[PDB]
């Protein structure tokens, strides 16, 4: 799987 940046915090 490719890993991406989170753009919306929980």
């Amino acid at each position, epitope marked *: *799987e*490719t*890993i*991406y*940046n*989170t*753009t*919306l*915090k*929980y």
Partner: antibody
Amino acid sequence: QVQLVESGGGVVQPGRSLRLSCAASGFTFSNHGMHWVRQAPGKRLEWVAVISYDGRHEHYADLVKGRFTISRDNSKNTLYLQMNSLRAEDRALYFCAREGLSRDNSGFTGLIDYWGQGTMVTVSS
Amino acid sequence: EVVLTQSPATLSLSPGERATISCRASQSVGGYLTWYQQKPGQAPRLLIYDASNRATGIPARFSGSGSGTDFTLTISGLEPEDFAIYYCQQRGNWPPITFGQGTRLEIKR
């Protein structure tokens, strides 16, 4: 090959409800955030809602707020979209989709990578 | 919301040619811009993310550029499978996640 199979769509009356289901396989369901996106006939893609991998955080598009509820049953690898108080403008092809993984799991990626085939919803009297 | 507007609405090209599609945003999304490919009534396919990164399995003829509010998708050496609808999506300022109105690549004649 990720597989997302939708069902539960159909024809409904204004004010009534539907609950869409999206069966997932071909990936680790419990690790990915999931989305619902809709597309009205001849119109553009409109984001509907998102839910975290563990179903603990949710966000909705203003238009469906208080009416739609996104949820998931990880044991069953199923994502749902409860659609209450349906309106004519809710008519559209509804897609469920997964988003890519984040590196630190501090939030969503918003990277919608794999989509289902969609299920149609028609609201009319 | 961040409104995405694509141009042109329809591009008439034939195999082998180069497609240039633009996507503009009402306000900055940094480089968090995604490009999708879709055929009517079918599942969209991820092509490029973060404006210029090609997704797994996506061929080199697909490239992207731009940042903030002005982006460009380029498809060189067009092949039959490329004639479809293309949508841009932003994940830089959400919710809500937003998409462009799409650009259709039709067969020229």
